[PDB]
Design an enzyme around this catalytic site. Structure first.
Site, short mmCIF file in Angstrom:
data_model
loop_
_atom_site.label_atom_id
_atom_site.label_comp_id
_atom_site.label_asym_id
_atom_site.label_seq_id
_atom_site.Cartn_x
_atom_site.Cartn_y
_atom_site.Cartn_z
N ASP A 75 0.81 -1.21 0.00
CA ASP A 75 0.00 0.00 0.00
C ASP A 75 0.85 1.27 0.00
OD1 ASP A 75 -2.60 1.49 0.70
OD2 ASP A 75 -1.35 2.07 2.38
N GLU A 96 1.50 -0.60 -4.89
CA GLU A 96 0.54 0.43 -5.31
C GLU A 96 1.24 1.75 -5.61
OE1 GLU A 96 -1.71 2.55 -2.52
OE2 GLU A 96 -3.26 3.19 -3.94
CL CL Z 1 -4.30 -1.33 -5.69
#
Ligand code: CL
Ligand code: CA
Length: 491
Positions: free
Chosen positions: A197, A233
Site C-alpha cells: 500500500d 501500489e
Molecule cells: Cl491497488
C-alpha cells in the site's frame, strides 16, 4: 518477488474487499478452488483505528494502530484458519500491507481500535508495536504543514504525511525491523505475497531493506527458495518525478493507466474506440507486461468517475472480459459490496460507507441458490461472464495474442494461439461475420452465454470449420455483447 506463487494453472487474484476471514476460507473451498482462481487479496489484516464519525468507513483500515492480526474481518485464529484452508485447496492469500504510516495525526488518543490497543497519535505513541516519536518522519519532513503539499517534490512525497497520516521512519532499522516482523508473521502463517500500500510514498530503497529481512514462503506449501509475490501500489499516469519503473527492483507495480484507458475506450469517450485496442499493452505507453498488475477498477477508484465498475454492469463485464482474454499483465478481478451511492452533483457523499454491517459488525456473505450473493455483497467474481473468463485466461496461458480483427470502429476480435478466441460488439449495430479463430475444427460452447456441461452447451454454440473460421452474430442490443470460446469449451 515477480512470481505470483499460485498453483500451476491459475492466473488471477480476486480482491475480496472487506470480506471476513471465515467467509474467505469458505469461498476458497466452495468456489475459488474449483473455478481456477489463483488467490485472494485481503483487506489489511492488522489492527486499525475504529472511526465512528463517519460510522466505520472502509478507509479506517488504512490507518494502522498496531500489527496485531485483529480487525473487523476477524482475529488471528480466524486469519490463520483462512490461510491454511485456502492453501490446502491451492488458493493463495495476498495481504494488503499498510506500512508507510500509522493513523491520522488528528485522531483522538484512546482505545478506539479494532483490538482495543491504546494509541496516542498526538504524542506519536503506539505501544502495541511499539513505536514512539522517534519512529516517525516529523523531523525529516521539510514542508510548513508537515503534510505532502507538492507532488513535484519527490522528497516530500516520501518523507511527509500523506493527508496527515503519521509517516513512519522507514529509513530506520528499528522501524524496518518491526514491519518485517509483522510481514514475517504473515509469511509463516502461509501468505504468498503482498500488495504494498502507498508505495509511491516510500523510497524504493526503504521498501527493499524491508523485503530483505523477510523469510522464504512457508515450506509446507511452497517450494524451496520461494519469495513473496510483491505488487506495489503506485498511481503513475505520467508527469511526476516519481515513476512506476522506480519500483521494478522490488516486484510488480499496479498499472493504473490500464483501467483508466480501458474505461475511456469502452465508454467510447474522448474519441476512443475499441479498434484502437489492437496494440493494447506497451503500445499504449504502459509499463512492461512482466511488471504490471492490471485491473479494470480497484477499491479506491470504483468510488470515483470514469472508471468502469459493477454499477456499469454491461460495459464492466466487457472490460473485464477483454482484460482477462488479453495477455498483458497479471490480472486482478474486483469483488465489491453495494453501498447507498448518493450523489450531490459529481460527488458521492456516501463514498465512505463501509461494508454491509449490523451496528458495525461486518455481515456474513450469504450464497444464493443461483450462485449470487446476498447481504449486499456484489460478488462480481461469481458473475458467470467473469468467472468463465477467469478460466479462459488459465486455459490460454502462454499463448500469443493473434488473429486480431476490427471493423475500424468498435467491433473487434482476437485469439490466444490455438487455445482461445473472443469477439466483442460495442458498436450500435449488429456484428455478423465469419472470422478466423485460430482454433481446431469443432463445436465450441460460448462461455459468456453459457457453459459446457455433460457433452452439450447450455448457451450459444459456435461452429469452427476445418479452416479455423467461424460465424459470429452479436446484436448491439445483446445484454452481454461478446462471445468467448476456448479449448476446454469444445465438445
Ligand atoms: Cl491497488
Ligand atoms: Ca512515507
Amino acid at each position: 518477488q515477480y512470481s505470483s506463487n499460485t498453483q500451476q494453472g491459475r492466473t488471477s487474484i480476486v480482491h475480496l474487499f472487506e470480506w471476513r476471514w471465515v467467509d474467505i476460507a469458505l469461498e476458497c473451498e466452495r468456489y475459488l478452488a474449483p473455478k481456477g482462481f489463483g488467490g485472494v487479496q485481503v483487506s489489511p489484516p492488522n489492527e486499525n483505528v475504529a472511526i465512528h464519525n463517519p460510522f466505520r468507513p472502509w478507509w479506517e483500515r488504512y490507518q494502522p494502530v498496531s500489527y496485531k492480526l485483529c480487525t473487523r474481518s476477524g482475529n488471528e485464529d480466524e486469519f490463520r484458519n483462512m490461510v491454511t484452508r485456502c492453501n490446502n485447496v491451492g488458493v493463495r492469500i495476498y495481504v494488503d500491507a499498510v506500512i508507510n504510516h500509522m493513523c491520522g495525526n488528528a485522531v483522538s488518543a484512546g482505545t478506539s481500535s479494532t483490538c482495543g490497543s491504546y494509541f496516542n497519535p498526538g504524542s506519536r505513541d503506539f505501544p502495541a508495536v511499539p513505536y514512539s516519536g522517534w519512529d516517525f518522519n516529523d523531523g525529516k519532513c521539510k514542508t510548513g504543514s508537515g503534510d505532502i503539499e507538492n507532488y513535484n517534490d519527490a522528497t516530500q512525497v516520501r518523507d511527509c504525511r500523506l493527508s496527515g497520516l503519521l509517516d513512519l521512519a522507514l529509513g530506520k532499522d528499528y522501524v524496518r525491523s518491526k514491519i518485517a516482523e509483522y510481514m514475517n508473521h504473515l509469511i509463516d502463517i502461509g501468505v504468498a505475497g503482498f500488495r504494498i500500500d502507498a508505495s509511491k510514498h516510500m523510497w524504493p530503497g526503504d521498501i527493499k531493506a524491508i523485503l530483505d529481512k523477510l523469510h522464504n514462503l512457508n515450506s509446507n506449501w511452497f517450494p524451496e527458495g520461494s519469495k513473496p509475490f510483491i505488487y506495489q501500489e503506485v498511481i503513475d499516469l505520467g508527469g511526476e518525478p516519481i515513476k512506476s519503473s522506480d519500483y521494478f527492483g522490488n516486484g510488480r507495480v499496479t498499472e493504473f493507466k490500464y483501467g483508466a484507458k480501458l474505461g475511456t475506450v469502452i465508454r467510447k469517450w474522448n474519441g476512443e474506440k475499441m479498434s484502437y485496442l489492437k496494440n493494447w499493452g506497451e503500445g499504449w505507453g504502459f509499463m512492461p507486461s512482466d511488471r504490471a498488475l492490471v485491473f479494470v477498477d480497484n477499491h479506491d477508484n470504483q468510488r470515483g468517475h470514469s472508471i468502469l465498475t459493477f454499477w456499469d454492469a454491461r460495459l464492466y463485464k466487457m472490460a473485464v472480459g477483454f482484460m482477462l482474454a488479453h495477455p498483458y499483465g497479471f490480472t486482478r478481478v474486483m469483488s465489491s459490496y453495494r453501498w447507498p451511492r448518493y450523489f450531490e452533483n459529481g460527488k458521492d457523499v456516501n463514498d465512505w460507507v463501509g461494508p454491509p454491517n449490523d451496528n458495525g459488525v461486518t455481515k456474513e456473505v450469504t450464497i444464493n441458490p443461483d450462485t449470487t450473493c446476498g447481504n449486499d455483497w456484489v460478488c462480481e467474481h461469481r458473475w458467470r461472464q467473469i468467472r468463465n473468463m477467469v478460466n479462459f485466461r488459465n486455459v490460454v496461458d502462454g499463448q500469443p495474442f493473434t488473429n486480431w480483427y476490427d471493423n475500424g470502429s468498435n467491433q473487434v476480435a482476437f485469439g490466444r494461439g490455438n487455445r482461445g478466441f473472443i469477439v466483442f460488439n460495442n458498436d450500435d449495430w449488429t456484428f455478423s461475420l465469419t472470422l478466423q479463430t485460430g482454433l481446431p475444427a469443432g463445436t465450441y460452447c460460448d462461455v459468456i452465454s453459457g457453459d459446457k456441461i455433460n457433452g452439450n452447451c447450455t448457451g450459444i454454440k459456435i461452429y469452427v470449420s476445418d479452416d479455423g473460421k467461424a460465424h459470429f452474430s452479436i446484436s448491439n442490443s445483446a445484454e452481454d455483447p461478446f462471445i468467448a470460446i476456448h479449448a476446454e469449451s469444445k465438445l
